[model samples]
Target: GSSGSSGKPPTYQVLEYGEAVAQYTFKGDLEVELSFRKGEHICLIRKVNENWYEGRITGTGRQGIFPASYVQVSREPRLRLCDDSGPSSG
Candidate 1:
């Protein structure tokens, strides 16, 4: 019998670089490396052709070398609120 619980939904963002990024909304920026400029502080996203773009994403999950087209972001291993747990402070 299945014992998996129904996890919360993920957050999706339409990148200005003509890509879509998804995340759990609870996790940090997923495709940050690909959006950040060389030495810029803020992430840079530029809209590309329809569903294509040029970014610098990490080699994690499905994100491979060269910015991926129609990129989709997501945040796995969601965090859960712990209640009535953990040891009390001394």
Candidate 2:
């Protein structure tokens, strides 16, 4: 095994300010007027807490805070290479 460290696998990779994709719907509460549907793309503005994030809708350009779990960082699919050999090797 190599002694060099590769560091961490990769942190959360939080979306850049004004960049993200909403994975779930978030109807605003009594204090917030923001509401969005699933798959609705959004742009993160800031993090509210460990469980919340503030962002704006990409379509209507609306802004509000939503659950952190409600959105996902949109990244291009990573390209991976692998051998086609059968897995009989122990």
Candidate 3:
């Protein structure tokens, strides 16, 4: 009869989440967009649209736009809260 205790989630989660990986070499011929190497990691800022995205070049603070075609989003699974139910359910 002592199994009535409830569980709690780890609120101390990471702040940033959006992750992506570069697919190929892309340069900003206009000198405005972001120029990333073939294997660099691009962090999340804002996906301008289906064709463009604004983010940083992993370590540095140089943020700019890049065509979505040049990068493949990482589909790796991430850690979730300790709750058995998902957020979508409630």
Candidate 4:
């Protein structure tokens, strides 16, 4: 399985993970983050190898959580970020 984040972005506010990431064969630095809003629910499902990268989040302006703007949409099933998953390969 590829390395994945815990539904949260790192210090640079960027999330980076991929299978090719393991072999160090990746071509470029393609990453994403979930920039969610307060009281918003964000769900994501992306197929990676034999597993599915799933991220479910509900935003809030609390002390231990990200303040709305941190929750983003970066992978498959890009519901909040766009209308479709992304560009079709075929």
Candidate 5:
């Protein structure tokens, strides 16, 4: 086994961002409004807005906010704050 410096890059550390999925889909107009598809596993931020939700598309980390009616809450994706997914290796 190579005991040398392991090239283990730290994964992105973001937790409890309130994950969700796109129950439906829509086109985006505002820069902050997200445009997603049925399979868009949206990682959401509920405190950002009430009527509209801000989040990143788990498929691509696309940041935006969209109407609440089109997305559905699912689970706590990104559930890590420590060794769960990061090591400061960037």
Candidate 6:
């Protein structure tokens, strides 16, 4: 894995697993390489570089470095619950 190398270390935002969506299809060259299709949900691990990001596919759980342009951040926020217990059924 390649680390961020340049002036001023890049700041990374820790995101929950399965928080990204693939925008393009990426096929690995090797047998063990990670591969994903467009619109697939991927878990972002870290921001390796300006153009690449370390992430895992939600379905396969395959970890690898993918191009930032290949995916978009999941902006849909999770629904918040007001309380632990809800209305009881009769």
State the lDDT at 88 in candidate 4. 91
Per-prediction count of colliding residue pairs? 6, 0, 0, 6, 0, 0
For model 1, the local distance difference test gives 0.33
List, residue by residue over 13-85, the lDDT tens digit for candidate 3: 3345556788988877554488888778777565665577667775665678888888876532234424665
**Quick one: best TM-score, which candidate?**
3
lDDT scores in order: 0.33, 0.61, 0.68, 0.31, 0.67, 0.63
Candidates 2 and 5 compared: the better one by lDDT is 5
Model 1 pairs whose backbones collide: 17-46, 21-73, 22-73, 22-74, 24-75, 34-56
For residue 25, model 2's alpha carbon misses the true position, in angstroms, by 1.9
TM-score of candidate 6 on Cα atoms, chains taken together: 0.52
Clashing pairs in 6: none
For residues 1-90, could you state the per-residue lDDT of candidate 4 as single tens digits?
136647655455113321111111112122332233343443433422223233333344221222122333334342344455666979
Deviation (Å) of 22 in candidate 6: 0.8
Q: Write down the TM-score of every candidate.
A: 0.20, 0.49, 0.58, 0.18, 0.56, 0.52
51: Cα error in model 6, Å: 0.8
Cα RMSD of predicted structure 3: 11.9
Cα-based RMSD of the predictions, in order? 16.2, 14.0, 11.9, 16.3, 10.0, 13.4
Pitting candidate 1 against candidate 3, the one with the higher TM-score is 3
Which runs in model 5 stand beyond 4 Å of their true positions? 1-15, 58-61, 75-90
lDDT of 1 by residue, 1-90 (tens): 235665655544433323335221211244433333232222224433233333334433322122433244321111232455665876
Q: By lDDT, is 2 or 6 better? A: 6
Write out the backbone clash pairs for model 3.
none
